[PDB]
Symmetry: D2
Subunit: 462 residues, 4 copies
């Protein structure tokens, strides 16, 4: 063990620990969810602390001898070698101070270990004085979050792109598959299954566009703002140097916000992302709702498509296969919706120079990106690639519908077309049967008029 | 045209009008929605103003000669005679102050007209000094709201009880109608259409209970609170008497809240009501969603039930009958959900002694109650009562299903039961026909195992 | 008092009414809010019908003698001459069918009267056969809504730009007004009032940017899609013409969507507009919360700014000036939040080829735009432009604060700073006086260090 | 390593693991959040499994040799020996089948071990045939949830009660502490600080009542419903016995639902709970907001109250004391708001005989209860108990206010009071001074009129 003194007393800390009293105190204050910060935030925090230490040495404010061990220690953090050391709740008071301090202590303590000194020897390397030099909670924390969110978003985009491409392949596969379109859930007129799947592919391409556009406002960073955005006693050179580093290491084209009070007190950039992610899930949920309807059956549903069986569906009926993959998509949607409200509430709660509610906001926005990425990947691997169409059954729906009379009409004139439809609806005979029965059209004439393609695309009938 | 002057200058009030300059300024400040306060709120404002006058006269604060006409004028407001004079926007700043003054001005000017004086002569009858005597915005305004919400709630309750009884009628009507149950939208085991409709009746019964129970907290009013809850300078007798009058004239069992500061600054009683409304609409929405699935077709859908046609259809497209009635239920549900968020955000916005965000809160609360009352009524009279079942289509689903097999499962044993299940998926044939030819159970045993009452009860 | 027979029986339509039984039926079916659709939507419906009449005539589908009057009648609808005649509820089932038919019936009957026949003679001019020719509910309705939203949106942008400029004018006005920054509602370091205001103007600048970019997806219309987006029996030339007519008479650069089925069944374009509106109101509500705090008092509060009085206050309680304008701002913000959830649930509700929940979504979308426009306008003219500062008050928050030691810190070393702050917090003595007390800095140097600009900019 | 089997194929499974093929499949299908279901749900599933086994033996449906061991294995789940073994994501497709099978497999495998048989040997103890006998996912899963929710709800109520009473103590401690009331954030008339705190106590007490009242509907369980609520094949003796065991081991007054179809397909009882949780956090958030304002300062805020410091401040900023405890309450409030929307959305998506969105729902409902319990406890312990009043500073606010003229008014007549009020406002002088300077009341007369109690309570002037 080891001891450290705080304004609240002393704490017995395990020797193997790299956190200190501040982190433990945050543990006592906020035992809220029992979760830890997402590893991408940890890696981002490492980047910030590596960038600050580096920039600080260059302008001679941090001693070159101790700064090198801070850098080396930050790199290990960036590698994810110290994730277990980050113990503070993502839902916490103090506006991210504990998260920042958690990084500061773990970085100072590894830096100390690497130069043969002892953990807790803060007179030599200080979590506050060296590791946190030139920076405030209110710049280090948000900056880390922009990096983390950006990195996570790029991922989402790649995975959403792959899913959208796979939606496009099914449209090609189903390009010629004819079915009944439905409106109000009531039979309408012929549609192609491939047109429904292209419709899914296009809304997603659009989702990809909106999500990507939200990265721009995240690129503006507030490093060098000090407490309130005024940059009081900040060195303009530290600023331009630390941003240049942060951009390189993170691999994002970060820019230093033009007005740092603006970048320090406003949280619109975050609500922008959530909104785009919400719109996306809305569309995904709807698509998932269609897939579950098309897979309904096997006998008292619609049975248009077959989903790859992904686990036994019933614990007392060995047979039936539920659409579990689309089901989990729906549940992620409802999650993202709920997260969006929490983010909306947190953003509006900002006061004067700081929004103290960012911890809960950042936990929800990170959660949404991650869980969307996750279901997206899983759903495309385990469902979307293997979806198969029941072409024969969907064809039978077409031959038996009243809707085909819409393609037949212009060839037969309005009066008789309506009498054929009325007769077919009431007797349960197909329109074809009646057209041939009353000698109104031939078997050959109807075969050309009921062409799957001409029925589902514009064009003058004659 | 007449002249009233203001700390912002002169405004001309049309001679036909009973509002004064204060109300006009409200208009210019808050031209937000173009809507006007609910007629039930107007009545309630009247009740509040009449109860107040009567108390102030009894306790000798209001001159008996002027108060007599104030009461008379307030009574006309209660009676709906002056609805068009209430012109301020339900979405407004000033924490309802404009609403209060709108009632005050109208009642002042009508009282003056009644005693042969000139409208606008606030020397003789003042909107603040008389009509608002012993009152604050912060008691009169929430008190009328409590009264109005309560009255609207009781009307919702009666409408919902009626609707619930019409569901339970349909449950009895479909008591013996067998159909295939669906979980995950995947065929399960048989169920009775009447059983689903009982499920509906029962969930609604629970909604009625939840809704009615939210009334109790509204019965506590803050009349007499003055600005914050302290009641500075108020007569304890004025408080005692005005509460009595408020209950008598409103027909609600109102109670003077036990801690006036609590009643003046907290707004939990409205969120409690909105929550119960929201829960009800969730259930309603789910039910409407089902209704629309059951009516889907007539060839490429489930076609289990028929809903009365409420659209003119198409003469080219017979059989297409859109479920417009459940559709409107869904959209009301979606509004209520939204209304509830607005109510929540407005409630959390309270600060110290007053929650000034009440004007938007109340407008949304009132909207919710009102719009559910209206769909509940229209849905009931134009859809629910007339729903018919397609018995053959449904019976046909049972006979041609695999699910039928868990019902004749320990009559043949598990031996040739998986032979009867792994072949019934293969051949695409019914299980009734695979029992009369194999010989494991003959016609007479299949006759009662597949009874519309046998396989749907433990 | 005319008579019209419905598949449900005879209804008596008033002498001077231009609607018909179909509209009346919607009235019976859906007496939900007692509201009417927005006039811009009425105007946009008229544009849809006028464009359709012109295309149908050119393409040879509509008789030109009859069509000539349909156009005339539609123009009157556009000029807003028949807003009274649009009586259906914006919360309605049937996926906008009755809104469409309300337009169809009004235009038919007014066309009839223009050509001197009796209203209701739908053998001559049919709401269905003529006024709704080559159209479905499922393309005419959305296209009207797209045009209506876009017009309203352009007003909102114009209004928001104005408000944003007035914020920027206030930032320049206050550019030299020193005050104490607060984080966690706790005294922090000094900040200019002008800087806070610049932060309001820039967030609104971004809101405008966001809101404006949402117009693009709305430009893609589905006119010609017919029932499901297949365009079954549709003449491509009709589709092509009607689109170009819609762009011209609406003022928007409308384009025929690339995939009509997609355009017919997806609703992402509306939630996109909603989301951007919601984000704007979050920022506006936050700003109004600050204004209300800044104006608190006048004795037991922050009392940093004076808002123009807008509510009459009592002679007996002067000083009490309630910030009603930011208050209304806050409530429109709350309104928009809930509208946005309604919009989300409506959109998620879509099934297969059509989302039937659009009326409640469109009602909500239009409300949001409409109430934002009106509250921005009133707030700008009745609060923002007339804001004043209490310079002296804020100036002495700074002088009397501990926070100011941050500006002094690197000039006197960290250790002396902490000794000075400690005495400051103990005795109440100003940090300025303490430095002179101990001769650690001269009056000269305090004037250079505690300079308003010097404390609030990098260095 | 080991090899297992189900209706879809084979999987490899670690030898030390107690879960099986069906669980491991779910981990592949739903790698969504990386969270695990709540301890209390694991406990409750054990109660379901133990009760059903006991009921199956007494009916002569389950072999007593094998059944004896299932019970013993189930008790160890109840004691929490095997939590590490429940690995399925709380956000999952299949409507809880995975959570149900996770328990079924863990219990079967441990039951085998106990009787000296091999793990995975389902020929001897089947997770489907033995452990899940007579029950479905669609009763076992929601029944374990009702029980779990009830036990967490009882704990919350208890903690909330404790909090409320601490607020009541504060109200008493501050009963005579005079301050200025504010409406619109503008100065109004005097109020007692304790009158405010009492108003906080009373809204919480109503919250307790609401939350507690949501329990009634959760007492009705659907055990014996099989797949759809029809109790197909299920034996009336079993239902009666199992219902009786569930109540005894759960400690709750559980009842068999009157209409099992209703209880199987309806979800109102969960949204009812969520709603009560939301209303509460609305109130809690407001109180927190008032607290953070009251704590504002120390020189440019309101400085009405002092919160126990829970955060080390720098020696450069003494007196800056961030209200970290109320801040976390606010963020928990926003979390709960979001969770309620997720819950509304999931409950709405029910279809026919089952709502398959229960997993995301249940996860958010358990999250809301738990995180409220946790902040409530921490907040009272690390903030509420230690709040002190700035009596002096608040008295000064009262004396320098304009609103005291409302008390003085009746003793003076309207017009003299008005004049004094206006002159006090414009000159910045105290109403008290102007009263003497002009001789409208004496020093002693004013001390009578400005009595802290008589100003903040109803009563005629004289
Ligand atoms: N959730 C399954 C039942 C089960 O797994 O026991 C179904 O309803 O299909
Ligand atoms: Ca029938
Ligand atoms: Ca000035």
């Amino acid at each position: 063990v080891r001891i450290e003194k705080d304004f609240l007393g002393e704490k017995e800390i395990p020797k193997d620990a790299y956190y200190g009293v501040q982190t433990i105190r945050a543990t006592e204050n906020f035992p809220i969810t029992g979760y830890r910060i997402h590893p991408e935030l940890i890696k981002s925090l490492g980047i910030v602390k590596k960038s600050a230490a580096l920039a600080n040495m260059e302008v001679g404010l941090l001693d070159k001898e101790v700064g090198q061990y801070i850098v080396k220690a930050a790199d290990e953090v960036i590698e994810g070698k110290w994730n277990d050391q980050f113990i503070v709740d993502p839902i916490q008071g103090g506006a991210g101070t504990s998260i920042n301090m958690n990084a500061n202590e773990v970085i100072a303590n590894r830096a100390l270990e690497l130069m043969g000194e002892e953990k807790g020897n803060y007179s030599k390397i200080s979590p506050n004085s060296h590791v946190n030099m030139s920076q405030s909670t209110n710049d280090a924390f948000p900056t880390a979050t922009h990096i983390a969110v950006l990195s996570l978003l790029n991922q989402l985009i790649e995975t959403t792109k792959y899913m959208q491409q796979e939606f496009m392949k099914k449209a090609d596969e189903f390009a010629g598959v004819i079915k009944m379109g439905r409106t109000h859930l009531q039979d309408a007129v012929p549609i192609l299954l491939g047109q429904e799947f292209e419709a899914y592919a296009r809304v997603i391409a659009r989702d990809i566009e909106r999500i990507a556009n939200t990265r721009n406002n995240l690129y503006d960073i507030n490093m060098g703002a000090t407490a309130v955005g005024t940059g009081l006693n900040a060195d303009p050179e530290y600023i331009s140097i630390v941003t240049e580093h942060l951009a390189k290491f993170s691999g994002h084209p970060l820019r230093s916000a033009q007005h740092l009070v603006d970048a320090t007190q406003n949280t619109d950039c975050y609500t922008e992302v959530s909104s785009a992610l919400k719109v996306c899930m809305i569309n995904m949920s709807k698509i998932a709702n269609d897939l579950r309807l098309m897979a309904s059956g096997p006998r008292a549903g619609l049975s248009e498509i077959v989903l790859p069986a992904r686990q036994p569906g019933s614990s007392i009926m060995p047979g039936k296969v539920n659409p579990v993959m689309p089901e989990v998509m729906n549940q992620v949607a409802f999650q993202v919706f709920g997260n969006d409200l929490t983010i909306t509430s947190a953003s509006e709660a900002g006061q004067f120079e700081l929004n103290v509610m960012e911890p809960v906001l950042f936990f929800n926005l990170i959660q949404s990106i991650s869980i969307m990425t996750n279901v997206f990947k899983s759903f495309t691997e385990n469902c979307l690639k293997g979806i198969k169409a029941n072409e024969e059954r969907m064809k039978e729906y077409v031959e038996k519908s009243i809707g085909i009379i819409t393609a037949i009409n212009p060839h037969v004139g309005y009066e008789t077309a309506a009498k054929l439809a009325r007769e077919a609806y009431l007797t349960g005979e197909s329109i074809r049967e009646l057209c041939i029965k009353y000698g109104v059209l031939t078997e050959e004439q109807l075969n050309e008029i009921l062409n799957p393609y001409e029925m589902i695309h514009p064009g003058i009938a004659g």
